[PDB]
């Protein structure tokens, strides 16, 4: 007929095509309709940040300090550590001379923070460290916040850039800017899980953070031969700032008086997710290529994370590649050409019964995250296997109990790149100039039940 | 009147601000509350990968092969294919001489996998091809997994980087690494939809895959003039390997015996999404500036995806731009400056009644994906229209069936760049050195109903 | 300024300051008396302001130009400070303390 751009007579033709299939799909007296949103009232509350008072010593590199959780709140649901890094000034009297650069290690945060623990009175609840932090961040980070996260945890292409001596071309100094590390805890996992501070007047809530020595937090790299040696006080200007200054911030949530009176004086049961780290095992690809490690876990495991870490140098961390990074052109750091994950294949065995056969490393690397996660890692390593449909979902999903399960093992196979990197003899700026050593780490995430009654906490199932 | 340590006075002040608006929004006896997550038990089950047993033929490039779905499982909800690419090495005896390079085509996966179908005995239920795979990947890609999916399909700066002859300065060879292609089916779209293998003891389920010859997968480019010629066995070393290592894996999920007996012998009704492609039409912008294409579809159409493909060379694929890609500086491929989508405008017509006017190409390119899609494409082309609020939502919504609809047509308009690039005359490294050819492809996603009864499946409507 | 400096302390305090500055104003007969005396509440009262006029000596000493051993050799900066002392009520019951009004 006619078209004007503002008429809607065309939609009637589409509407008139109401056949049997459309009748089955849509329509009906009880059928809901769009363009109408049901509104239901929610609770009346208020949130605000809150200071956390330190109780054990003062922050310092290589030392452990404790902070109590502030009371007089109703629900605590956030926690983050803010730390002001010191200023680094390289000196001309370095042991490496002109061919020497100093730079911050990759992932400064998730480093210098190990055995971060939460305790009720004198009963430990959970703890985590660098491996769990790295795996969880690489596997369950929502896109869009990646820039913010890798700008707040370091990795800003400014602290990780090698800096030559004062007498060389690169005289830039590493800036001293504060960094923020959120602390992944069970109450911080979801809003529905919050610590009932009002309901818990007897248990004392404590957080224990152990820092790391500044010696292993700085990478001292040779520009030419690509060799790493530990840093010393005389190598940098101003000495080593052993003491560091930091805070712990948490967010509390106030609730209405009627709600608190109604909910005060009752028993509650909550489901939480913990961490279990298997003891590290040294792997030597020169002798053997197949390594079997026994796994000993207790509760319903939800996922298994593992990787092989280049443990040759303590200064460099979060290196899950057979070859260490080396200095590159333009005062930058770049990975050598031969830089691949040492793991080739893996399998799981339950009391001499392989539940999962010898699948390829690419399977765990890509296929499993594509289906049972919210993100895919952008770095080599971090091989995972999840028994659940959604790892990030706090609601329970498929899992296998390990308490009633007989002893099980995981078998891994090395790679020709790993076995050739284990032997030294690499040329300059190749990373594998010196012999390399590797270690195997296994992390497990399991469910648990916590009961709150009579103003106290505990694990009924242990 | 203080703010020291823990602060609750500010929270009390904030809570005191209660008025009519706050009373209407929050509060009430029936109002829900946060910090308290309701817990409801779910079913007990387990899942594990399972190999799929080939029944017909051998996996080789250029023909058809089918794999049966393993029985004895309880639910099948995931399927993917693994394929190891061969090793390619250039030879000095190439026809093009020094001015000649060989590289893998862009998007190696989704290519050489055409007419991939799922068959119930001898009745088809779902079939997809390269165009549908590309459109779905570009329009429904969750962020964070984009890099992982890209690495799975290739494009890792090694497959797509041209390699010169051995005698020249650059003599690198294309590595041989396995790649994984997930299979998007109705049961793989959502966890709620899965094949009840226990309920289907008599039906036979097959997955049929057609491969393509390596001639159409390998791109042989001229270094200077940017011309592409078909490859021959004598050009490269090793020869054309017809056979290839490739397998199909699927994930099965066991369930508790308590519920399988209860659900045995019951009628199941499901909704599924299927794809249907209009036949391709050759478009010559030199003779005409507008193209009319008739659509003939059956069921409730969800969306239409259309794009004009540069089909000048069968060697190069997944190219929807008026100018073919050419070799660039630095031993890499660079897209020429003249690179725009040939379509300038598009419109729909219902029995000579214009439902959708001559809207701009940028509308379909950006505005429609912004409002009714989960992602926006990062490449030129892939225009789409949607009849529903959410394309990726499994639940049905706004959709008009074409069974009762009369003949419908789509009108597309070329561009001055397309009409000038259709003829040749371009200089070296310009893309349109040789005359170009274009084709139009239309993809429609529709709904259908699947009924399960008496250990068999049929179409109630058909 | 001499009013606040001398007259108010002479009548409503136990001492008079011996240093420059320290200007005060009390709504009560005795500043140091623990027992309540004349006072007004600012919670019900609307916004109140205090306006202070500077001095020619201050405006000439704010800039530099002073010679040696003059104090105002360098440019000078000043800041205004206001302190208020008020009353409140504390309730002790049930083995705890709090403000019934706050």
């Amino acid at each position: 007929t006619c078209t004007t751009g503002a008429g809607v007579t065309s939609g009637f033709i589409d509407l008139a095509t109401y056949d049997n299939l459309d009748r089955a799909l849509y329509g009906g007296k009880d059928a809901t309709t769009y363009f109408i949103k049901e509104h239901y009232p929610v609770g009346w509350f208020t949130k605000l940040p809150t200071m956390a008072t330190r109780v054990s010593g003062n922050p310092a590199f290589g030392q452990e300090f404790s902070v109590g959780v502030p009371r007089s709140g109703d629900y605590v649901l956030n926690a983050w550590l803010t730390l002001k890094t010191p200023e680094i000034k390289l000196l001309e009297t370095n042991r490496l001379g002109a061919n020497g650069t100093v730079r911050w290690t990759k992932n400064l945060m998730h480093n210098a923070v190990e055995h971060a623990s939460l305790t009720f009175n004198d009963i430990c609840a959970q703890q985590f460290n660098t491996a769990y932090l790295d795996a969880w961040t690489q596997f369950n980070m929502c896109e869009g916040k990646r820039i913010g996260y890798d700008n707040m945890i370091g990795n800003t292409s400014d602290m990780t850039n090698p800096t030559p001596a004062q007498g060389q071309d690169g005289a830039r100094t590493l800036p001293s800017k504060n960094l923020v590390l959120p602390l992944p805890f069970f109450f911080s996992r979801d809003c529905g899980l919050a610590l009932p501070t009002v309901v818990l007047p007897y248990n004392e809530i404590r957080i224990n953070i152990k820092l790391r020595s500044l010696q292993e937090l700085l990478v001292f790299q040779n520009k030419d031969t690509g060799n790493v040696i530990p840093i010393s006080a005389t190598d940098i200007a101003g000495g080593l700032a052993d003491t560091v200054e930091a805070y712990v911030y948490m967010t509390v949530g106030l609730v209405s008086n009627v709600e608190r009176c109604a909910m005060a004086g009752t028993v509650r049961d909550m489901v939480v997710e913990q961490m279990q780290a298997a003891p590290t095992h040294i792997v030597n690809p020169q002798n053997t290529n197949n390594v079997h490690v026994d796994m000993r876990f207790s509760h319903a495991v939800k996922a298994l994370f593992f990787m092989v870490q280049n443990v040759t140098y303590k200064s460099v961390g979060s290196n899950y590649t057979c070859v260490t990074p080396v200095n590159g052109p333009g005062n930058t750091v770049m990975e050598p050409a031969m830089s691949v994950d040492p793991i080739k294949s893996a399998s799981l065995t339950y009391e001499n019964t392989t539940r999962l056969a010898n699948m390829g490393v690419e399977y765990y690397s890509l296929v499993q995250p594509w289906y049972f996660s919210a993100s895919i890692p952008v770095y080599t390593g971090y091989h995972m296997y999840s028994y659940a449909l959604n790892v990030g979902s706090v609601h329970p999903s498929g899992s296998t109990n390990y308490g009633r399960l007989t002893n099980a093992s995981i078998t891994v196979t090395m790679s020709p790149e790993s076995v050739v990197a284990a032997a030294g003899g690499g040329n300059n700026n190749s990373g594998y100039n010196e012999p390399q050593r590797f270690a195997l780490v296994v992390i497990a995430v399991n469910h648990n039940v916590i009961r709150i009654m009579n103003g106290s906490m505990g694990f009924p199932i242990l | 009147t203080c703010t020291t340590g823990a602060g609750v006075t500010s929270g009390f002040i904030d809570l005191a601000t209660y008025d009519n608006l706050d009373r209407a929004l929050y509060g009430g006896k029936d109002a829900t509350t946060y910090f308290i997550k309701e817990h409801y038990p779910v079913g007990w089950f387990t899942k594990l990968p399972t190999m799929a047993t080939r029944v017909s033929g051998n996996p080789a490039f250029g023909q058809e092969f089918s794999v049966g779905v393993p029985r004895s499982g309880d639910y099948v909800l995931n399927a993917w294919l693994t394929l190891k690419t061969p090793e390619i090495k250039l030879l000095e005896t190439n026809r093009l001489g020094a001015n000649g390079t060989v590289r893998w085509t862009k998007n190696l996966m989704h290519n050489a996998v055409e007419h991939a179908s799922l068959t119930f005995n001898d009745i088809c239920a779902q079939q997809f091809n390269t165009a549908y795979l590309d459109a779905w990947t570009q329009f429904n890609m969750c962020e964070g997994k984009r890099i992982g999916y890209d690495n799975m399909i290739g494009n890792t700066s090694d497959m797509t980087n041209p390699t010169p002859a051995q005698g020249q300065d650059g003599a690198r060879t294309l590595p041989s690494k396995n790649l994984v292609l997930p299979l998007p089916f109705f049961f793989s779209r959502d966890c709620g939809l899965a094949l009840p293998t226990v309920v289907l003891p008599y039906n036979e389920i097959r997955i049929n895959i057609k491969l393509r010859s390596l001639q159409e997968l390998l791109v042989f480019q001229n270094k200077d003039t940017g011309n592409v010629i078909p490859i021959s066995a004598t050009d490269i070393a090793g020869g054309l390997a017809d056979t290839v290592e490739a397998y199909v894996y699927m994930t099965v999920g066991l369930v508790s015996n308590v519920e399988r007996c209860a659900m045995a012998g019951t009628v199941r009704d499901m909704v599924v999404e299927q794809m249907q492609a209009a036949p391709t039409h050759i478009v010559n912008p030199q003779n005409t500036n507008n193209v009319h294409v008739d659509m003939r579809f059956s069921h409730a159409v969800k969306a239409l995806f259309f794009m004009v493909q540069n089909v000048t060379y069968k060697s190069v694929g997944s190219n929807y731009t008026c100018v073919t890609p050419v070799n660039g500086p630095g031993n890499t491929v660079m897209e020429p400056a003249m690179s725009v989508d040939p379509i300038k405008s598009a419109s729909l017509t219902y029995e000579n009644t214009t439902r959708l006017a001559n809207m701009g190409v940028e509308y379909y390119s950006l505005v429609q994906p912004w409002y009714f899609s989960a992602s926006i494409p990062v490449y030129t082309g892939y225009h789409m229209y949607s009849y529903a609020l959410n394309v990726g939502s499994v639940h049905p919504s706004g959709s008009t069936n074409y069974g009762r609809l009369t003949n419908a047509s789509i009108t597309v308009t070329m561009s001055p760049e397309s009409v000038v690039a259709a003829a040749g005359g371009g200089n070296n490294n310009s893309g349109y050195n040789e005359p170009q050819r274009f084709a139009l492809v239309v993809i429609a996603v529709n709904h259908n109903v699947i009924r399960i009864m008496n250990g068999s499946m049929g179409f109630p409507i058909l | 300024v001499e009013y606040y400096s001398l007259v108010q302390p002479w009548y409503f305090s136990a001492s008079i300051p011996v240093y420059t500055g320290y200007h005060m104003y009390s709504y009560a007969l005795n500043v140091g008396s623990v027992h309540p005396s004349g006072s007004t509440n600012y919670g019900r009262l609307t916004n109140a302001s205090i306006t202070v006029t500077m001095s020619p000596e201050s405006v000439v000493a704010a800039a530099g130009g002073g010679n040696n051993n003059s104090g105002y050799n360098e440019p000078q900066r000043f800041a205004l400070v206001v302190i208020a002392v008020n009353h409140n009520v504390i309730r002790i019951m049930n083995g705890s303390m709090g403000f019934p009004i706050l």
Binding site: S298, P460, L462 | - | S96, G98
Partner: peptide, 29 residues
């Protein structure tokens, strides 16, 4: 203008311990 009212009453800080619950049915197996 009235300014409303909002008292602050801290809700208890106990220094004792009524009874310590014990752990039963361990997952050690």
């Amino acid at each position: 203008w009235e300014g409303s009212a909002n008292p602050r009453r801290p809700e208890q800080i106990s220094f004792g311990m009524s009874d310590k619950p014990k752990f039963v049915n361990d997952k050690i197996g």
